[PDB]
Design an enzyme around this catalytic site. Structure first.
Site, short mmCIF file in Angstrom:
data_model
loop_
_atom_site.label_atom_id
_atom_site.label_comp_id
_atom_site.label_asym_id
_atom_site.label_seq_id
_atom_site.Cartn_x
_atom_site.Cartn_y
_atom_site.Cartn_z
N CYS A 47 0.82 -1.21 0.00
CA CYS A 47 0.00 0.00 0.00
C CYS A 47 0.84 1.23 0.00
CB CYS A 47 -1.09 0.01 1.07
SG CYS A 47 -0.62 0.77 2.65
N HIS A 48 0.20 2.39 -0.15
CA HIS A 48 0.86 3.69 -0.18
C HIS A 48 1.82 3.88 1.00
CE1 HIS A 48 1.06 8.07 0.67
NE2 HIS A 48 1.64 7.98 -0.53
N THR A 49 1.52 3.27 2.18
CA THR A 49 2.41 3.39 3.36
C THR A 49 3.83 2.88 3.04
OG1 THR A 49 0.45 3.23 4.71
CG2 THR A 49 2.60 2.92 5.86
N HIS A 69 3.94 -4.39 5.30
CA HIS A 69 3.16 -4.41 6.55
C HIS A 69 1.80 -5.12 6.40
CE1 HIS A 69 1.75 -0.93 4.36
NE2 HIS A 69 0.57 -1.12 4.97
N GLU A 70 1.44 -5.60 5.19
CA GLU A 70 0.15 -6.30 5.01
C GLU A 70 0.49 -7.70 4.59
OE1 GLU A 70 -2.67 -4.37 2.45
OE2 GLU A 70 -1.97 -2.36 3.04
N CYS A 99 -0.72 -5.28 23.54
CA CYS A 99 -0.08 -6.02 24.64
C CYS A 99 -1.12 -6.45 25.66
CB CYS A 99 1.05 -5.21 25.29
SG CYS A 99 0.48 -3.91 26.40
N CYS A 102 -1.05 -2.52 28.97
CA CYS A 102 -0.64 -1.12 29.11
C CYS A 102 -1.82 -0.16 29.37
CB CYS A 102 0.15 -0.68 27.88
SG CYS A 102 -0.91 -0.38 26.44
N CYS A 105 -4.18 -0.24 26.22
CA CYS A 105 -4.98 -1.44 26.05
C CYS A 105 -6.08 -1.56 27.11
CB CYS A 105 -4.10 -2.68 26.03
SG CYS A 105 -2.96 -2.77 24.62
N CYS A 113 -1.85 0.83 21.50
CA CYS A 113 -0.86 0.21 22.39
C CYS A 113 0.54 0.75 22.06
CB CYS A 113 -0.91 -1.30 22.22
SG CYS A 113 0.29 -2.21 23.23
N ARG A 117 6.48 0.26 20.29
CA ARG A 117 6.66 1.43 19.41
C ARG A 117 8.10 2.02 19.39
NH1 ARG A 117 3.91 6.75 21.45
NH2 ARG A 117 5.85 6.52 22.65
N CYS A 177 -4.30 -4.08 7.50
CA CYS A 177 -4.23 -2.66 7.14
C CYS A 177 -5.52 -1.94 6.69
CB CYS A 177 -3.07 -2.37 6.19
SG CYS A 177 -2.79 -0.61 5.88
N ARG A 372 -5.72 -3.36 -4.33
CA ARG A 372 -4.58 -4.01 -3.69
C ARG A 372 -3.93 -5.02 -4.64
NH1 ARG A 372 -4.47 -0.40 -0.14
NH2 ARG A 372 -4.24 -0.80 2.10
N1 LIG Z 1 -5.39 5.81 9.62
C1 LIG Z 1 -4.93 4.55 9.38
O1 LIG Z 1 -4.76 3.72 10.28
C2 LIG Z 1 -4.59 4.18 7.95
C3 LIG Z 1 -4.29 2.85 7.62
C4 LIG Z 1 -4.11 2.48 6.30
C5 LIG Z 1 -4.19 3.44 5.30
N2 LIG Z 1 -4.44 4.72 5.60
C6 LIG Z 1 -4.51 5.88 4.60
O2 LIG Z 1 -5.55 5.70 3.70
C7 LIG Z 1 -5.32 6.50 2.52
C8 LIG Z 1 -5.90 5.82 1.31
O3 LIG Z 1 -5.22 4.56 1.08
P1 LIG Z 1 -5.62 3.70 -0.22
O4 LIG Z 1 -4.78 2.47 -0.18
O5 LIG Z 1 -7.09 3.52 -0.27
O6 LIG Z 1 -5.13 4.67 -1.39
P2 LIG Z 1 -5.53 4.75 -2.94
O7 LIG Z 1 -4.38 5.34 -3.67
O8 LIG Z 1 -6.00 3.38 -3.44
O9 LIG Z 1 -6.79 5.71 -2.94
C9 LIG Z 1 -6.72 7.15 -2.81
C10 LIG Z 1 -7.80 7.70 -3.71
O10 LIG Z 1 -7.91 9.13 -3.52
C11 LIG Z 1 -8.18 9.71 -4.77
N3 LIG Z 1 -7.83 11.13 -4.71
C12 LIG Z 1 -6.58 11.68 -4.77
N4 LIG Z 1 -6.57 12.99 -4.70
C13 LIG Z 1 -7.91 13.32 -4.57
C14 LIG Z 1 -8.57 14.55 -4.35
N5 LIG Z 1 -7.95 15.73 -4.36
N6 LIG Z 1 -9.90 14.52 -4.13
C15 LIG Z 1 -10.54 13.34 -4.18
N7 LIG Z 1 -10.03 12.12 -4.41
C16 LIG Z 1 -8.70 12.18 -4.58
C17 LIG Z 1 -7.37 8.88 -5.77
O11 LIG Z 1 -7.92 9.03 -7.07
C18 LIG Z 1 -7.59 7.47 -5.21
O12 LIG Z 1 -8.73 6.85 -5.80
C19 LIG Z 1 -3.82 6.77 2.49
O13 LIG Z 1 -3.60 8.15 2.77
C20 LIG Z 1 -3.31 5.89 3.63
O14 LIG Z 1 -2.31 6.58 4.37
C21 LIG Z 1 -4.66 5.11 6.93
ZN LIG Z 2 -0.74 -2.25 25.18
ZN LIG Z 3 -1.27 -0.80 4.12
#
Ligand SMILES: NC(=O)c1ccc[n+]([C@@H]2O[C@H](COP(=O)([O-])OP(=O)(O)OC[C@H]3O[C@@H](n4cnc5c(N)ncnc54)[C@H](O)[C@@H]3O)[C@@H](O)[C@H]2O)c1
Ligand SMILES: [Zn+2]
Ligand SMILES: [Zn+2]
Ligand SMILES: NC(=O)c1ccc[n+]([C@@H]2O[C@H](COP(=O)([O-])OP(=O)(O)OC[C@H]3O[C@@H](n4cnc5c(N)ncnc54)[C@H](O)[C@@H]3O)[C@@H](O)[C@H]2O)c1
Ligand SMILES: [Zn+2]
Ligand SMILES: [Zn+2]
Lengths: 379, 379
Positions: A47-49, A69-70, A99, A102, A105, A113, A117, A177, A372
């Protein structure tokens, strides 16, 4: 077993430098120490991460590293004092630990948790503050406590979710994820009520899981916003009822939404990681009770802004981390739901490739014309 | 009565133009039209909200006007169709209406009734979209739908709270603004649980009411923050358990708080209206669950900012409007709490003066040491 207590030699995609192609190497994987689990990684998704750290734009980035991470796999060995899992167990290694003991948790108010970290954040294990990966006797940094781009990884026991052994590992690797993040943003973080009007910014894997979560919550309307109108048709099956492409409107996106929902939405979810869009997602919420949940992880250093009148007048600003799910306690429950066909997982996977194709998967991810991509680690 | 259906001639403190002393004038007060109540204002209090408009800093400010929004009085007459109140009833005119039958009142998730805001926001009555006040046949704008600096005012019936006739009007005039805003920020917006750790930024009337609300909520620690250390002693009586003067620490205030609370507070309340302090109030909240409530009203156009990681990691940003209290349904309930000795009101009044002393009262408020100043309108 053959490998128990021994240094393993296996294949791993190594990021020697940022923004350069990944190199499949032979790596040494040290046996697990106290409180550790050595996992045979059968399938990893990306993923993007992973891309953010690989790009070189991450201030927390450490090179050389094993990203990923996935994943889903099988316990090869356990270190001293590990009892929740044993060799042969099917597991999902999670970037968010649990854990169970903590402040966090035992709070009952969060999934954050912090037990491991300080070690995972610097690409090492807690027991000895060193990495379990090496090439020519030189260490390779871990990543997010998971390092799933290695055929074998060593993770902290508190990060290992024990799952139903009948669950397909090439599918459930997503449950560490994106999918729980999206579902939990709705069910745990926002706690969306039936009849709610929802706005989802970003229709990627995360936004599509938010859409699925909001549909399970009984949202009356799920408005999907994306700058790529080709992402609209696939979104309908995930629960999206209406669409808006902001590039088709001269007026701010929040204004379009406000115009279509008699004052704004009950809940908005930003699933992009764009600070400008995060402000619009807040401002598109209805006066008095509207709540915007930040799901997108913005690039380090960037700030979110609004005028405080927005919050004085009833709007709430919150965010989610792994959808508020507790990894060890709840990821297995999500696998159960998926097996009972209660949640979708398969529909978020567009491509299956092999470990050797890692760079091709990243290029495809960079194009953004997939959801994905799942890699078979042992072809 | 003697004045029913007739134009009243009375004294009123008029603001002819911004940043000039108020003039005690003889004004003509028209009788109430449909859905209107003419109130004999016995006592008015003053607050920063009256000063912001008076100073000329308010871009929504319309001159000449009758300011004032914290008062208590007696109904002199009612317009056609008014049934909840009758001549002789003791009342608190409220800047926040409660029509009981709009999107907001019915919703059950907010106190932000929009029934009369279009008219009150432009200093007029809804029925004919004109002012009820005139001098030499020329209109004088209303303010906040209340205009309590006139011995007689005309307000919308949906903004009139009917109260216990034994309540002392020189004290309960405070229950139309500051006191309910502070108490409600705790009880209604934040919903502070017993044992919480609370930070209160700004120890003026509002911050002190927050401290009283938090103490009644069973908070374990109430940390008061003010740039003036002279405000610390009087704050103990309001429930503030510890104090910090930001000027005495080179580290940002949020770090000082985090260091004293094992990661941050459970709830923070910004009671100043300062965007930089609003950011500190959010950031001083604990990871995972910490909630910040914006109570202070910032100058128009000013923006709040933070890094989105603060929300993704579990902090919640919200705000309050009149403490989430529904004016007609709940202001009488607060009058009742005061009469039960369940809540303080007297303690926020540092001075009692007369209408003729209005400018002296504004001078005191500008010095910023006093709490509430109450004016006897009929001396
Ligand atoms: N908070 C958490 O725990 C956590 C966990 C996992 C992923 N994420 C975050 O989720 C986000 C999305 O992940 P993904 O795998 O679905 O990504 P992705 O690339 O598959 O999807 C992002 C989408 O946003 C669209 N987009 C981009 N710019 C835009 C704009 N200005 N307006 C509207 N749409 C727009 C893209 O066209 C795309 O379809 C990432 O930023 C990732 O960091 C957060
Ligand atoms: Zn914990
Ligand atoms: Zn991910
Ligand atoms: N949201 C609502 O419905 C609502 C209603 C009424 C009042 N208010 C707001 O409440 C706020 C407070 O009202 P009040 O009558 O108590 O005002 P006040 O003048 O009595 O108190 C403000 C306090 O803030 C302190 N202060 C100023 N700058 C500071 C800083 N940087 N750090 C710490 N302390 C600092 C001052 O010393 C003072 O003690 C105002 O902004 C007003 O708009 C909001
Ligand atoms: Zn006031
Ligand atoms: Zn209403």
């Amino acid at each position: 077993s053959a490998t128990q207590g021994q240094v393993i030699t296996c294949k791993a995609a190594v990021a020697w430098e940022p923004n350069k192609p990944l190199v499949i190497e032979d790596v040494q994987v040290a046996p697990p120490q106290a409180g550790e689990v050595r996992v045979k990684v059968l399938y990893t998704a990306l993923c993007h991460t992973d891309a953010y750290t690989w790009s070189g734009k991450d201030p927390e980035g450490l090179f050389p590293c094993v990203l990923g991470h996935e994943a889903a796999g099988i316990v090869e060995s356990v270190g001293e004092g590990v009892t929740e899992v044993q060799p042969g167990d099917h597991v999902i290694p999670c970037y968010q630990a649990e854990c169970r003991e903590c402040k966090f948790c035992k709070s009952g108010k969060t999934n954050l948790c912090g037990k491991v970290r300080a070690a995972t954040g610097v690409g090492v294990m807690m027991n000895d503050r060193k990495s379990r990966f090496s090439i020519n006797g030189k260490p390779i940094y871990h990543f997010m406590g998971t390092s799933t781009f290695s055929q074998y990884t060593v993770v902290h026991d508190v990060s290992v979710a024990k799952i139903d052994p009948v669950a397909p590992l090439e599918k459930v690797c997503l449950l560490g994820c994106g999918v729980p993040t999206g579902l939990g943003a709705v069910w745990n973080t926002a706690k969306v009520e039936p009849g709610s009007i929802v706005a989802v910014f970003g229709l990627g894997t995360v936004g599509l899981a938010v859409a699925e979560g909001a549909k399970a919550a009984g949202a009356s309307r799920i408005i999907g916003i994306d700058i790529d109108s080709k992402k609209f048709d696939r979104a309908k099956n995930f629960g999206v009822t209406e669409f808006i492409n902001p590039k088709e409107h001269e007026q701010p996106i929040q204004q379009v939404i406000v115009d279509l929902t008699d004052g704004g939405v009950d809940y908005s979810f930003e699933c992009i990681g764009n600070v400008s869009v995060m402000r619009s997602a807040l401002e598109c919420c209805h006066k008095g009770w509207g709540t915007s949940v930040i799901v997108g992880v913005a690039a380090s250093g960037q700030e979110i802004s609004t005028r405080p009148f927005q919050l004085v007048t009833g709007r709430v600003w919150k965010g989610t981390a792994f959808g508020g799910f507790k990894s060890r306690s709840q990821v297995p429950s999500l696998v159960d739901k998926y097996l009972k066909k209660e949640i979708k997982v398969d529909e978020y996977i567009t491509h299956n490739m092999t470990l050797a194709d890692i760079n091709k998967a990243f290029d495809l991810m960079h194009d953004g014309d997939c959801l994905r991509v799942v890699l078979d680690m042992f072809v």
